């Protein structure tokens, strides 16, 4: 029978794969999704291509390609701040709404798991998972 | 309460942390542990630095640095491949002994987790995780 190591590894992998598949139905790649999410979380101040590249640990050309694609779909816009030198990036309403969709996808995946079990059995499983987690924390 | 997504993420993370803490008793990093295991698994054929990089899903100086460190420790050796003049990497006897140790440690971690739950609870947990995994597939 499978080890807990294996089960948790494969669940980790498959949740990422399922999420990527769901996002692709909205024509968003994994790195496009991370870009939109990063923008969403940091919108309150000026963010440049360089800021994004540092945070994502990707090259300038990769990020320039990511951003051109998103801008072409009007999920983001870019403008001049350091004038000329720096262009800042913001999300449009559609960009915001897609980030919300991402949250919906994660919530619906969670609901799918919860629906596998009765309320009573969910209580048992979460209690037991919590004991397993605590044993690893101490 | 926490979500399953969060519990699973945290469990995976803490398992990695505990394993890494154990590996560090032998002065072996997470990536080095994976590297040694991958070499062990594929040792019967020639394996290159590029093969290691692809297995770790890493690029850059961390890959060359971790390999040079293993080599200085004589846990691995490198040799010119006759078929491709890209060097191949092999485990020394010591390297294999370390992989064996690590396997025992990982096995111990599994048993320690199992020991947290009753027999009935463990069977239930694995059946439910399997049910969940299958649905994500």
CA atoms within 13 A on the CB side of B92: 11
Task: Select the residue of B106, B121, B130 nearest A5 (Cβ to Cβ).
Answer: B106
Best residue in B116, B123, B127, B131 to probe A by mutation, most A CBs within 10 Å? B116
Beta pairing partners, A91? A76
Closest CA to B31 of B2, B59, B3: B59
Candidate from B1, B9, B128 with C-beta closest to A117: B128
The answer to whether the Cβ–Cβ distance between A18 and B136 falls below 8 Å is yes
CB A108 within 8 A of CB A46: no
Q: What are the angstrom distances between the C-alpha of B106 and each of A6, A52, B124, B127, B128?
A: 11, 38, 22, 21, 22
Is A5 in Cβ contact with B109 (below 8 Å)? yes
Chain B residues with CB inside 8 Å of A109's CB? 5, 136
Tokens coding A125 = 């499983």
Whether B78 and B30 have beta carbons less than 8 Å apart is answered as no
The answer to whether the beta carbons of residues A70 and A98 sit under 8 Å apart is: no
Angle of helix B93-114 versus helix A4-24 axis, rounded to 10: 90
In angstroms, what CA-CA distances link B103 with B23, B33, B107? 11, 10, 6
- Residue of A5, A62, A111 to mutate when probing chain B, most B C-beta within 10 A: A5
- Convert B87-103 to b/e letters by CB count within 10 Å (16 or more is b): ebbebeeebbebbeebe
Of B77, B101, B90, the residue nearest B27 (C-alpha): B101
Residue B84: count of CB within 10 angstroms of its CB: 10
User: Which domains does chain B possess?
Assistant: 1-137 (1.10.10.10)
- Secondary structure (3-state) at B78: strand
Cα dihedral sign, A101-A106-A111-A113: positive
A117 in B contact zone (CB under 8 Å):
yes
Which residues, 6 or more positions from B32, have their beta carbon under 8 angstroms from its beta carbon? B23, B66, B69, B70
Paired tokens of A130: 């919590």
Which residue in this structure is represented by tokens 């990089």? B53
CA A74 to CA A97: how far, in whole Å?
A: 12
Tell me the technique behind this structure.
X-ray
d(CA B71, CA B42): 18
β-pairing, A76-80 with A87-91? antiparallel
DSSP A48-97: BHHHHHHHHT--HHHHHHHHHHHHHTTSEEEEE--TTT-EEEEE-HHHHH
Question: CA–CA distance from A48 to each of A56, A82, A94, A99 (Å)?
Answer: 12, 11, 20, 19
What gap in Å lies between CA A2 and CA B132, rounded to an integer? 14
Instruction: With CA atoms as reference, report the closest residue to A33 among A75, A64, A93.
Output: A75
Whether B92 and B67 have beta carbons less than 8 Å apart is answered as no
Closest residue in A to B131 (Cα) is A116
Residue B92 gets the label, from left (phi > 0), alpha (psi -120 to 50) or beta, of beta
Cα separation, B130 vs B124, in Å, equals 10
Alpha-carbon span B96 to A102, nearest angstrom: 44
* Chain B contact for A9 (CB, 8 A cutoff): yes
CA–CA distance, A41 with B7 (Å, rounded to integer):
23
Residue B80 is inside which H or E element, if any?
strand B76-80
Strands B76-80 and B87-91: antiparallel
User: Among A2, A109, A117, whose Cβ lies nearest the Cβ of B126?
Assistant: A2
């Amino acid at each position: 029978e499978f080890t807990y190591s294996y089960l948790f590894r494969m669940i980790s992998h498959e949740m990422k794969q399922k999420a990527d598949q769901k996002l692709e139905q909205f024509d968003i790649t994994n790195e496009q999704g991370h870009t939109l999410g990063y923008l969403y979380a940091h919108q309150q101040d000026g963010l440049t291509q360089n800021d994004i590249a540092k945070a994502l640990q990707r090259t300038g050309p990769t990020v320039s390609n990511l951003l051109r694609n998103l801008e072409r779909k009007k999920l983001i816009y870019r403008y001049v701040d350091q004038d000329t030198r720096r262009k800042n990036i913001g999300l449009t309403t559609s960009g915001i709404k897609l980030v919300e969709v991402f949250t919906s996808i994660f919530d619906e995946m969670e609901q799918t798991l919860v629906s596998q079990l009765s309320e009573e059995e969910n209580e048992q499983m979460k209690a037991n998972l919590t004991k397993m987690l605590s044993s690893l924390q101490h």
